[PDB]
Amino acid sequence: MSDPVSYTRKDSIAVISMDDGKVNALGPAMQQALNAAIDNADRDDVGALVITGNGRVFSGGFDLKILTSGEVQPAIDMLRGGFELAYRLLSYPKPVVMACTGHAIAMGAFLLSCGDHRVAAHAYNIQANEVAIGMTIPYAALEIMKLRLTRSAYQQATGLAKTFFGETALAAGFIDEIALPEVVVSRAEEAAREFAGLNQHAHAATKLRSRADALTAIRAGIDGIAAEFGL
Amino acid sequence: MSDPVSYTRKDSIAVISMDDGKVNALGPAMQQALNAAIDNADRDDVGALVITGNGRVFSGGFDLKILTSGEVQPAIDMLRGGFELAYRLLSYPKPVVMACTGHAIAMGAFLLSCGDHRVAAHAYNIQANEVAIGMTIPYAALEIMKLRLTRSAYQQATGLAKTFFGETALAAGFIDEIALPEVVVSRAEEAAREFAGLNQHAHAATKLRSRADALTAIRAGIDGIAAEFG
Amino acid sequence: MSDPVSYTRKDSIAVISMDDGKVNALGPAMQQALNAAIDNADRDDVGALVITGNGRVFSGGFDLKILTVQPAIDMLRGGFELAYRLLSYPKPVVMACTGHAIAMGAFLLSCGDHRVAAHAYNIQANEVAIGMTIPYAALEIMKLRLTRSAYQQATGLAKTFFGETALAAGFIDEIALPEVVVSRAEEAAREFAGLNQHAHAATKLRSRADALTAIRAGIDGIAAEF
Ligand SMILES: [Cl-]
């Protein structure tokens, strides 16, 4: 799909929407488009970001074709880019609100877990499915999940590839708020406009303090990706 | 008011009540009065402590006048003393039960978070409001919250200044028990009496083990308080 | 009793049941019998393990006669080695909590990848109530599963959990009716045996790395601090 990310500034917020016409795979093209959209948000100096998926998914994860192939450097580059995007969003100086508009799997769940506030509908599944399909979870991904999940949810989400949704996702720490499907996006935008009213300097400084060790470990995980591939 | 804390021994427990006639601001006078009451508990060798607020709040937090007066050293000194009190309570060798008798804001919430057991009523708001009013949360306060809040509640409580109460406070780890307003204090006292029946030596040793990293992090936060402002 | 652990292979899984006829005390004999049953699972290369208690308890904990110095140290080290063996097990481990789980019984329960109990069953580290400081190895096992605030109360206040409160605390993962705790555990185990074994084993070690290091330290330190 020709333009997998849209960027729209609406007063105090920017809305960044993923729709590649498929499952919003976080391959190189999608990552480039997402980074370009956040660059726009930087230039526009917005009060808050909203990131959404499409009518089917938030994101189904990395480009599975690149993963299943066995190619080495392309996979390393895709994983590094995905986790760098996570680092960028977790450290973002403005509030970031995720509109989880469908299921969020693997890198989709990791991306979702970078929002300051995360809104989903009851039925939307959130899952690190890596272990179910033969992939060991990268250290950077573990650190992203560890930052948000309860101790017991973290255990099951990782080693057992547990699927969460609705009340179990809320209790686990995979999402912060449940809304009806037709208002997930509007509620995300409402929340973003509210958070834009927080003191930006204090928000930016405090969120970094509240994530310092995780960010350091994510950085280490990004640096270590090639070694995870035996290089 | 000049006499903001009362101390009452009731057999196996001591009840320490904050009431400055207003919102129990945790300025130097209140901190000294709380410390004096805890000194009394030390001398009495009580089985457990109960700390309460007044009829309208647990505590609204630090003295707002001192906090925003522009005079840096008095503000630093007040924060230091507040976090020192938190350290003292988190490491206290007897069970400590908090009766959250109204809202608990900022340092009020941090103080609340030092209790082994914390009781509130459903409508009582518990909130680190720093970011909403333009303040970065001090490291010592972050570490206090980090010890009690779930991973996701910690994120929202801090960077988003989220308000918690009732079920969300329970789920988050900002409180351990919700009771009707009229029985918050008596529930806290009853719980304290039961905890006084635990083995004190094992309680004191176990709680320190269960808080070891938090305590060193809080101590670092206290030692680095001036550097936070310069 | 004379034969306190049973081992049965069914489908892709092994079911290991503790029943010493009493409260499944985790003394040296029970630990040896459990280790031998896990050996069977190793030899059979099973897809997953289910560990159950008996009709009255999961386990009441250590043999108190021994705990109340060298025999005590040895029993504690052995119990925490058993915990370590299960926490690091290369196949999914499902616990069928068939009654209460107290002290070492709760620590053992907390080593399962998935833990199923009935609403009524109490789970508690009662050490502080009975005059014992909780060992570091036990603290680290609990710290891996309990929420921040449940961890505080479970330890220093010897809080008892059950059903929805155990679920919220992270002392269990699933509640089932008493009569289906074991069958649900087996169903979960069959499901988990379908996960990729290599990825499961590698990922669980990563998700538990710091805890395993700290539990090893806790085992090593059992004597130095008794
Ligand atoms: Cl947690």
Q: Which segments of chain B does DSSP mark as H helices, in order?
A: 28-44, 64-67, 72-90, 107-112, 139-148, 151-159, 166-172, 184-195, 200-210, 212-223, 225-229
In angstroms, the CA C168 to CA C162 distance is 10
Distance linking the first and last C-alpha atoms of chain A: 33
CB under 8 Å to B109, separation ≥6 — which residues? B61, B126, B127, B128, B145, B174
CB contact under 8 A, C200 and A160: yes
Residue C100 contacts residue C117 (beta carbons within 8 Å): no
CB under 8 Å to B140, separation ≥6 — which residues? B79, B83, B86, B217, B218, B221, B222, B225
Could you tell me how many residues make up chain B?
230
User: What would you report as the CA-atom Rg of chain A, rounded to the nearest whole angstrom?
Assistant: 16
Residues of chain B positioned with their CB less than 8 A from the CB of C129: 198-199
Could you tell me how many residues make up chain C?
226
In angstroms, the CA B216 to CA B213 distance is 5
The single-letter code of the amino acid at C124 is Q
Residues of chain B positioned with their CB less than 8 A from the CB of A119: none
Q: Is the dihedral of CA A82, A83, A85, A86 positive or negative?
A: positive
CB contact under 8 A, C133 and B205: yes
Query: Which residue in the set C128, C130, C149 is minimally distant from B148, CB to CB?
Result: C149
Classify B221 as helix, strand or coil: helix
Distance from CA of C74 to the nearest CA of B (A): 21
Classify B94 as helix, strand or coil: coil
In angstroms, the CA B99 to CA C187 distance is 45
The single-letter code of the amino acid at A122 is H
Q: Which two tokens stand for residue B168?
A: 């969300």
In angstroms, the CA B180 to CA A128 distance is 41
Domain ranges in chain C? 1-226
User: Across the beta sheet with B163-164, what order do the strands follow?
Assistant: B57-59, B103-105, B126-127, B163-164
Elucidated via: X-ray
In angstroms, the CA C164 to CA C155 distance is 19
Instruction: Return the number of other C-beta atoms located less than 10 Å from residue B45's C-beta.
Output: 10
Classify A9 as helix, strand or coil: strand
Q: Which helix (H) or strand (E) holds B106?
A: none
Q: Which helix (H) or strand (E) holds A12?
A: none
Among B21, B17, B33, B78, which Cα is nearest to B225's? B78
In angstroms, the CA A192 to CA A51 distance is 10
Instruction: Return the number of other C-beta atoms located less than 10 Å from residue C220's C-beta.
Output: 12
In angstroms, the CA B121 to CA B139 distance is 28
DSSP A76: H
Q: Which helix (H) or strand (E) holds A143?
A: helix A139-148
In angstroms, the CA A180 to CA A184 distance is 6
Query: Which residue in the set B136, B150, B154 is minimally distant from A205, CB to CB?
Result: B136
Task: List phi, psi (to 5°) of B81.
Answer: -65, -35
Residue A147 contacts residue A133 (beta carbons within 8 Å): no
How many whole angstroms from its chain centre is CA A200? 21
In angstroms, the CA A99 to CA C205 distance is 33
Residue A28 contacts residue A4 (beta carbons within 8 Å): no
Q: Which helix (H) or strand (E) holds A50?
A: strand A48-52
Give the distance between the most distant pair of CA atoms in chain A: 48
Task: List phi, psi (to 5°) of A135.
Answer: -105, 130
Q: Is the dihedral of CA A99, A104, A108, A110 positive or negative?
A: positive
Full DSSP string of B71-85: -HHHHHHHHHHHHHH
The single-letter code of the amino acid at C222 is I
In angstroms, the CA A110 to CA A170 distance is 15
In angstroms, the CA C47 to CA C13 distance is 5
CB contact under 8 A, B199 and C168: no
**Contacts of range A113-116, beta carbons closer than 8 Å, 24 or more positions apart:** A113/A86, A113/A144, A113/A145, A113/A147, A113/A148, A113/A174, A114/A85, A114/A86, A114/A89, A114/A90, A114/A144, A115/A51, A115/A89, A116/A195, A116/A207, A116/B155, A116/B156, A116/B159, A116/B160
In angstroms, the CA C158 to CA B194 distance is 11
For the purposes of burial, counting CB atoms within 10 Å of the CB of C88, is it exposed (0-12), middle (13-18) or buried (19 or more)?
middle
Full DSSP string of chain C: --S-EEEEEETTEEEEEE--SSS---SHHHHHHHHHHHHHHHHHT-SEEEEE--SSEEE--S-HHHH--HHHHHHHHHHHHHHHHHHT-SS-EEEEE-SEEETHHHHHHTTSSEEEE-TT--EE--GGGGT-PPPHHHHHHHHTTS-HHHHHHHHHT--EE-HHHHHHHTS-SEE--GGGHHHHHHHHHHHHHTS-HHHHHHHHHHHTHHHHHHHHHHHHTTTTT-
In angstroms, the CA B71 to CA B78 distance is 11
Residue C110 contacts residue C171 (beta carbons within 8 Å): yes
Task: List phi, psi (to 5°) of C194.
Answer: -80, -15
Distances (CA, A) of A183 to A46, A119, C204: 22, 10, 37
Q: Which two tokens stand for residue C133?
A: 């400081």
Residue C113 contacts residue C90 (beta carbons within 8 Å): no
Residue C159 contacts residue C124 (beta carbons within 8 Å): yes
DSSP A35: H
The single-letter code of the amino acid at A127 is Q
DSSP B149: S
Q: Which two tokens stand for residue A196?
A: 């834009």
CB contact under 8 A, A158 and C202: no
In angstroms, the CA B97 to CA C89 distance is 40
Classify B163 as helix, strand or coil: strand
CB under 8 Å to C71, separation ≥6 — which residues? none
Classify B96 as helix, strand or coil: strand
Among B116, B88, B103, B109, which Cα is nearest to B188's? B116
Task: List phi, psi (to 5°) of A8.
Answer: -140, 120
In angstroms, the CA B197 to CA B168 distance is 30
In angstroms, the CA C163 to CA B8 distance is 38
Parallel, antiparallel, or unpaired for β B5-10 and B13-18? antiparallel
**Any bridge partners for residue C18, and if so which?**
C5
Distance A210 CA to ligand 1 centre (A): 14
Among A11, A221, A225, A196, which Cα is nearest to A97's? A196
Domain B1-230 has CATH 3.90.226.10: yes
**Resolution of the experimental model in angstroms, please?**
1.2
In angstroms, the CA B39 to CA B189 distance is 19
In angstroms, the CA C38 to CA C93 distance is 11
Options 3.90.226.10, 3.40.50.300, 3.30.930.10, 3.40.50.2020; which CATH number does A1-231 get?
3.90.226.10
Parallel, antiparallel, or unpaired for β B177-178 and B117-120? parallel
Full DSSP string of B18-33: E--SSS---SHHHHHH
CB contact under 8 A, B134 and A195: no
Q: What is the 3-state secondary structure (H, E, C) of A102-116?
A: CEEECHHHHHHCCCC
**Any bridge partners for residue A8, and if so which?**
A15
In angstroms, the CA B30 to CA B36 distance is 10
Distance from CA of C152 to the nearest CA of B (A): 7
In angstroms, the CA B68 to CA A98 distance is 35
How many whole angstroms from its chain centre is CA A12? 22
Task: List phi, psi (to 5°) of B109.
Answer: -65, -40
Q: Which helix (H) or strand (E) holds B15?
A: strand B13-18
Residues of chain A positioned with their CB less than 8 A from the CB of C208: 155
Residue A228 contacts residue A139 (beta carbons within 8 Å): yes
How big is the CA angle at C191 (ends C190 and C193), to the nearest 5 degrees? 65
Distance from CA of B65 to the nearest CA of A (A): 20
Residue C95 contacts residue C47 (beta carbons within 8 Å): no
In angstroms, the CA B91 to CA B211 distance is 8
CATH superfamily of C1-226: 2-enoyl-CoA Hydratase; Chain A, domain 1 (3.90.226.10)
Residue A28 contacts residue A81 (beta carbons within 8 Å): yes
Place of tokens 């009496």: B193
In angstroms, the CA C88 to CA C33 distance is 19
